[PDB]
Design an enzyme around this catalytic site. Structure first.
Site, PDB file in Angstrom:
ATOM      1  CG  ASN A  77      -1.823  -1.226   1.232  1.00  0.00           C
ATOM      2  OD1 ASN A  77      -1.671  -2.090   2.090  1.00  0.00           O
ATOM      3  ND2 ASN A  77      -2.738  -1.320   0.269  1.00  0.00           N
ATOM      4  CB  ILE A  84      -0.053   6.279   2.798  1.00  0.00           C
ATOM      5  CG1 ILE A  84       1.347   6.616   3.377  1.00  0.00           C
ATOM      6  CG2 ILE A  84      -0.669   5.156   3.601  1.00  0.00           C
ATOM      7  CD1 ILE A  84       1.295   7.521   4.586  1.00  0.00           C
ATOM      8  CB  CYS A  85      -3.350   3.261  -1.161  1.00  0.00           C
ATOM      9  SG  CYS A  85      -5.001   3.222  -1.924  1.00  0.00           S
ATOM     10  CG  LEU A  86      -4.963   4.820   5.714  1.00  0.00           C
ATOM     11  CD1 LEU A  86      -5.351   3.381   6.002  1.00  0.00           C
ATOM     12  CD2 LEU A  86      -3.842   5.260   6.655  1.00  0.00           C
ATOM     13  CE  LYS A  90      -6.788   6.876  -1.213  1.00  0.00           C
ATOM     14  NZ  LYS A  90      -6.840   5.597  -1.984  1.00  0.00           N
TER      15      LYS A  90
END
Ligand SMILES: NCc1nc2ccccc2s1
Length: 152
Positions: A77, A84-86, A90
């Site tokens: 991730n 960071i993909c979290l 978002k």
């Protein structure tokens, strides 16, 4: 309102930080911060120290903090530039940022992400497949990446 809320948060981070987590002012401004997360036990990141950049946007707390790793880390991730993909970083409808969260809670989520990756929503496709299908090799590469970049 914004300035007022940031003071409350900085105070809490200085006095009651979450276990393993530190956050602080780089300069003389409350919206250019730095943090540090210690690699957890029962993870390949153990005994590592990871530094992050935390930018607070002008519309905080209605937009989330902008956070990226400065210390390299090998994780499905997290990309080679530290993004960071979290979900809590978002805005909705895809994301989960809401103003009843704060800087401490998102740092704790990033810490949880380090223990428990999501290969369903990867940013590094090769690392993500290695995690699913060759778990022992993932663990070996993570520990090597840790020792090189997160220590001494
Ligand atoms: N700035 C954080 C990171 N930097 C790098 C560099 C190479 C591979 C992974 C990462 S994560």
């Amino acid at each position: 309102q914004r300035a007022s809320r940031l003071k409350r948060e900085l105070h809490m981070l200085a006095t009651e930080p979450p276990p393993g987590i530190t956050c602080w002012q780089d300069k003389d401004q409350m919206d250019d911060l730095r943090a540090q997360i210690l690699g957890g036990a029962n993870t390949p990141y153990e005994k590592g120290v990871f530094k992050l950049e935390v930018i607070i946007p002008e519309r905080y707390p209605f937009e989330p903090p902008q956070i990226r790793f400065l210390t390299p880390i090998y994780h499905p991730n997290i990309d080679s530039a530290g993004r960071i993909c979290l979900d809590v970083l978002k805005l909705p409808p895809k994301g989960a940022w809401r103003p009843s969260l704060n800087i401490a809670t998102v740092l704790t989520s990033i810490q949880l992400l380090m223990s428990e990756p999501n290969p369903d929503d990867p940013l590094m496709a090769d690392i993500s497949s290695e995690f699913k299908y060759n778990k022992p090799a993932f663990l070996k590469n993570a520990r090597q990446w840790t020792e090189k970049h997160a220590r001494q």
